Amino acid sequence: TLNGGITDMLTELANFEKNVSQAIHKYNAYRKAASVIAKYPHKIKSGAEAKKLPGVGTKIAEKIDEFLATGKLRKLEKIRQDDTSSSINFLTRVSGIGPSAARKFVDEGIKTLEDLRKNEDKLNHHQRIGLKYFGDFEKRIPREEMLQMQDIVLNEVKKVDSEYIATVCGSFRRGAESSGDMDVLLTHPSFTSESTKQPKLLHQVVEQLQKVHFITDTLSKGETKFMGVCQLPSKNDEKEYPHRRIDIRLIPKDQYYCGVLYFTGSDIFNKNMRAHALEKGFTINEYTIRPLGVTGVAGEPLPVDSEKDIFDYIQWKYREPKDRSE
DNA sequence: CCGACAACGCATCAGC
DNA sequence: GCTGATGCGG
DNA sequence: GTCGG
Numbered sequence: 001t002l003n004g005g006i007t008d009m010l011t012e013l014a015n016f017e018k019n020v021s022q023a024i025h026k027y028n029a030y031r032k033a034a035s036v037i038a039k040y041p042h043k044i045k046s047g048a049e050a051k052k053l054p055g056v057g058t059k060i061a062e063k064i065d066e067f068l069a070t071g072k073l074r075k076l077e078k079i080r081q082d083d084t085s086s087s088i089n090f091l092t093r094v095s096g097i098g099p100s101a102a103r104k105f106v107d108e109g110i111k112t113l114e115d116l117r118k119n120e121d122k123l124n125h126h127q128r129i130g131l132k133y134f135g136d137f138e139k140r141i142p143r144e145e146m147l148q149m150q151d152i153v154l155n156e157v158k159k160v161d162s163e164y165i166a167t168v169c170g171s172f173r174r175g176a177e178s179s180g181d182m183d184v185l186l187t188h189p190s191f192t193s194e195s196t197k198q199p200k201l202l203h204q205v206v207e208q209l210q211k212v213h214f215i216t217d218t219l220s221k222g223e224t225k226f227m228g229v230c231q232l233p234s235k236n237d238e239k240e241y242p243h244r245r246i247d248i249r250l251i252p253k254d255q256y257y258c259g260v261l262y263f264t265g266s267d268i269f270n271k272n273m274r275a276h277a278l279e280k281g282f283t284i285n286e287y288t289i290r291p292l293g294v295t296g297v298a299g300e301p302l303p304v305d306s307e308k309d310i311f312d313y314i315q316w317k318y319r320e321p322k323d324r325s326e
Numbered sequence: 327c328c329g330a331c332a333a334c335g336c337a338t339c340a341g342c
Numbered sequence: 343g344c345t346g347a348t349g350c351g352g
Numbered sequence: 353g354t355c356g357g
């Protein structure tokens with residue numbers, strides 16, 4: 001955070017282009033700059049110095065100089081004052097509400113937490129739960145609580161079927177001291193890229209996590225991706241732990257490494273590694289990495305037996321989870 | 327210049 | 343009912 | 353908004 005001031009500015013600029021401008025690319029460009037500048041081991045003294053880092057162009061360069069001079073960005077000072085932009089930005093903070101639904105509500109005149117509350121009949125299921133746990137979801141999860149949640153999830157899963165393998169990924173696997181949520185990659189021998197010999201593999205687990213009252217709500221649930229809520233149990237007289245977001249992804253066992261790579265992130269690391277991958281002539285997703293013929297069509301899945309194998313194909317020196325926090 | 331920008335599961339809608 | 347486009351995730 | 357060709 002040697003440049004915490006600069007990277008926050010870019011993030012705010014990025015959330016704006018995304019929520020208000022619905023200009024996803026500017027959003028991604030800004031996040032990239034914030035990212036590269038964030039790992040830069042020096043306290044940036046000027047736009048020029050920043051323009052050197054890849055991802056930082058001329059526009060961002062000027063903003064950084066202005067920011068270093070005045071201590072703020074005019075363009076942001078204005079954005080903060082515009083009521084429409086502040087409403088949209090706010091609503092989007094509710095899980096389930098994005099740029100579109102956010103702008104839609106404002107038109108209707110629904111632009112404050114009070115409004116959403118007295119208009120629950122105008123939200124889909126996810127949005128409703130996102131409203132219910134509005135505060136909680138804004139709270140980070142201390143690694144210790146993560147470790148505690150991990151035990152429940154792994155033990156409960158072990159109970160449903162000893163052959164289930166549950167690995168906690170996301171920022172937890174990258175070793176963060178706090179996480180925005182808990183991410184769980186789940187595999188079982190019956191579900192392989194070749195065949196699904198057992199149905200409801202994800203359902204059963206979710207069902208077990210519910211019986212023990214660990215999982216309390218469901219944002220969305222399909223055969224391989226579950227999006228919901230959970231809560232650590234509290235002791236007698238102890239004030240309750242906040243409700244936490246939980247993501248569970250069922251992946252074919254033979255595709256574990258591509259799956260764990262992806263789910264370990266970060267999102268920006270994935271974006272960059274996948275981008276590079278293409279440049280090297282490959283395509284990478286949560287399931288496999290494949291080659292690319294001039295035509296464009298992906299080829300057949302290359303053999304993978306470790307995360308490193310994936311790094312090797314693209315000719316990138318392996319990077320432990322802790323170093324993928326971009 | 328200017329196209330490209332990672333990738334995909336689920337919820338929900340339009341159109342048939 | 344389906345298929346496809348869009349939103350959201352994030 | 354930035355980038356490589």
Ligand SMILES: O=c1ccn([C@H]2C[C@H](O)[C@@H](COP(=O)(O)NP(=O)(O)OP(=O)(O)O)O2)c(=O)[nH]1
Binds near residue numbers: 179182
């Ligand atoms: O846009 C995305 C989002 C997530 N992911 C992957 C990487 C990320 O680490 C993982 C889990 O998603 P989260 O949104 O939970 N992010 P993460 O766990 O890294 O951080 P946080 O602590 O905020 O949850 O899914 C992507 O590839 N693209």
Ligand SMILES: [Cl-]
Binds near residue numbers: 022023024025
């Ligand atoms: Cl854009």
Ligand SMILES: [Cl-]
Binds near residue numbers: 285287288
């Ligand atoms: Cl695939």
Ligand SMILES: [Mg+2]
Binds near residue numbers: 170171179181182183
């Ligand atoms: Mg996470």
Ligand SMILES: [Mg+2]
Binds near residue numbers: 170183
């Ligand atoms: Mg998550």
Ligand code: NA
Binds near residue numbers: 056
């Ligand atoms: Na640059």
Ligand code: NA
Binds near residue numbers: 091093096098
């Ligand atoms: Na939101």
